[PDB]
Structure formats: structure tokens, C-alpha cells
Design a protein around this ligand. Structure first.
Ligand SMILES: [Tl+]
Ligand SMILES: [Tl+]
Ligand SMILES: [Tl+]
Ligand SMILES: [Tl+]
Ligand SMILES: [Tl+]
Ligand SMILES: [Tl+]
Ligand SMILES: [Tl+]
Ligand SMILES: [Tl+]
Ligand SMILES: [Tl+]
Ligand SMILES: [Tl+]
Ligand SMILES: [Tl+]
Ligand SMILES: [Tl+]
Ligand SMILES: [Tl+]
Ligand SMILES: [Tl+]
Ligand SMILES: [Tl+]
Length: 95
RNA sequence: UGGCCGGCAUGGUCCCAGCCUCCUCGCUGGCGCCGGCUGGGCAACACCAUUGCACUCCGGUGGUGAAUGGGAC
């Protein structure tokens, strides 16, 4: 089941009461120190709420963020992080 | 009234204050009573359901089944 290292970390178990614009800003606030972030994808649709895709420019940053913030209390909930299953289009359009 | 009708009650017109609200939050909006038909949208708010791997926004339901007094002519 486990996923292979990726530029994009998949975060779930996020407080679903937070508006999209705010959630993105807040995630950037804590994850930006791990390395440049190309984009953060969030959607509030039934299928996608409580989840987010932080897209790092370098896999090292994403690996660092995954281990360093695993289970970090965010909006009162323990963030759960993994590597996304596949690359984000932004990553493909480059690499 | 979001949009529409019926029954009842109710002298007029302003002024101040408080309060109300999913569909022109406010002073050239509304704030007696009862009942009935019905459009839009989940945008905010609430609730229900959801732990879900995306890169095309995109689950559902609910609210107006609302809000008072005083003052001047
Ligand atoms: Tl109405
Ligand atoms: Tl009427
Ligand atoms: Tl009167
Ligand atoms: Tl008033
Ligand atoms: Tl209103
Ligand atoms: Tl008003
Ligand atoms: Tl008014
Ligand atoms: Tl009104
Ligand atoms: Tl009615
Ligand atoms: Tl009525
Ligand atoms: Tl309706
Ligand atoms: Tl939409
Ligand atoms: Tl669709
Ligand atoms: Tl909804
Ligand atoms: Tl009065």
C-alpha cells in the first residue's frame, strides 16, 4: 500500500471547517520552511475535503516535511501525511 | 412574501430606540393574528453524511415556523 517518494505530500485528517483560502495560507505558514513550495491544492468537494496536496519543488523538502510534521496538531487535529500516489501536473510540466 | 393568495384584526402621519433576516442586513427594509400554494441557491450560517489521492466548480437538509416598545403631532 505504501507510496514511493514524491515532490508532493498528501495530507489528510485536516479540520474540514476551514475555508479553502485560509487552509492554503495556513499550510504555507508551517510547511514553507522545508523548501520552496510550487503550490498547495485543496478542494472542499465531498470526495476531497479534509485533504491537501502540498507540492514541493524538491523531493528532499517533501521528505523532510513528511517526517517532521507527521501528526502535527493543526486546527485541533493530528495531521496525517504521506507522499501522493502520483506526480502533480505542475511537476510533470517541469520534470 | 424570495414569489402568491385567503381569513381575521387594525384610525393617520412622522421621529427616536431596540430587535429581526438563506434569497436586495438597512434607516425612502421589516417587527398585529391564522392558514394555504409555490421558485432559486447551497454563497454565508447550521446540521447530517464523509478519513476521502487530486490536478474540470460540483453530497444532502434547514432557516422569514423572524423581530418591540416609547415619543410627537
Ligand atoms: Tl418567504
Ligand atoms: Tl394575506
Ligand atoms: Tl394612532
Ligand atoms: Tl432602529
Ligand atoms: Tl432579508
Ligand atoms: Tl432598518
Ligand atoms: Tl427599518
Ligand atoms: Tl424584509
Ligand atoms: Tl403562510
Ligand atoms: Tl401565513
Ligand atoms: Tl425553495
Ligand atoms: Tl459550483
Ligand atoms: Tl460534474
Ligand atoms: Tl453541502
Ligand atoms: Tl410605537
Amino acid at each position: 500500500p505504501e507510496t514511493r517518494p514524491n515532490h508532493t505530500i498528501y495530507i489528510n485528517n485536516l479540520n474540514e471547517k476551514i475555508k479553502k483560502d485560509e487552509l492554503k495560507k495556513s499550510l504555507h505558514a508551517i510547511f514553507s520552511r522545508f523548501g520552496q513550495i510550487l503550490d498547495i491544492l485543496v478542494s472542499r468537494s465531498l470526495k476531497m475535503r479534509g485533504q491537501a496536496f502540498v507540492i514541493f519543488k524538491e523531493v528532499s523538502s517533501a521528505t523532510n516535511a513528511l517526517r517532521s510534521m507527521q501528526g502535527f496538531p493543526f486546527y485541533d487535529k493530528p495531521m496525517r501525511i504521506q507522499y501522493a500516489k502520483t506526480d502533480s501536473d505542475i511537476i510533470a510540466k517541469m520534470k
